[PDB]
């Protein structure tokens, strides 16, 4: 339930359906930073402590996630979990 929250509760990791495109299947501790970061996927990254305290009222805000997207990024993803998929789809020529 990496990707679950106080409001979501669906037991699921942050790894999207069928994996982070071009990277893999995150299975260790991770950092989720708002917005974007210099560099591309699979690159070594340094996260460094701030060099100054920010009052700023924009920092110091104590965010709390409601729902973290985990739909597929390899297309126009429509389902968060595979359970949700079978729930909305029905049964197919393979399953049973």
């Amino acid at each position: 339930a990496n990707g679950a929250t106080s409001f979501d509760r669906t037991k699921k990791t942050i790894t999207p359906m069928g994996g982070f495109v071009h990277y893999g299947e995150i299975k260790n501790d991770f950092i989720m930073v708002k917005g974007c970061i210099p560099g591309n996927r699979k690159r070594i990254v340094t996260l460094r402590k701030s060099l100054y305290t920010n009052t700023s009222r924009k920092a110091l805000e104590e965010v709390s996630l409601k729902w973290i997207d985990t739909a597929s990024k390899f297309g126009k993803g429509r389902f968060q979990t595979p359970a949700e998929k079978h729930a909305f789809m029905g049964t197919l020529k393979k399953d049973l």
Binding site: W67, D69, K76, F79
Partner: protein, 98 residues
């Protein structure tokens, strides 16, 4: 946080996803992606698009066990004869003879 549905296909539009379109008459149309939207702009009819919900419901596809029996009954069998009617004199007469 509401998950919306596509007004052409039936797809769940999670937040941010898809596009929203305010028609001239103020009727609102949401699409999960630019596929349904282009079909919609094309004046296509979801009941003739084989993968839409409105099509599958119409052609009665995959709804097999949703039309089976159930068990949702109850049981009460109580008595409270009539208000102000001296219900303490309405049980000494409700002792059916036949």
């Amino acid at each position: 946080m509401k998950v919306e549905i596509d007004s052409f296909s039936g797809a769940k539009i999670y937040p941010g996803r898809g596009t929203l379109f305010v028609r001239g008459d103020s009727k609102i149309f949401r699409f999960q992606n630019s596929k349904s939207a282009s079909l919609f702009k094309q004046r296509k009819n979801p009941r003739r698009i084989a993968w839409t919900v409105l099509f599958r419901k119409h052609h009665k596809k995959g709804i097999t066990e949703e039309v089976a029996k159930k068990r949702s009954r109850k049981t009460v069998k109580a008595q409270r004869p009539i208000t102000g009617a001296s219900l303490d004199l309405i049980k000494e007469r409700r002792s059916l003879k036949p």
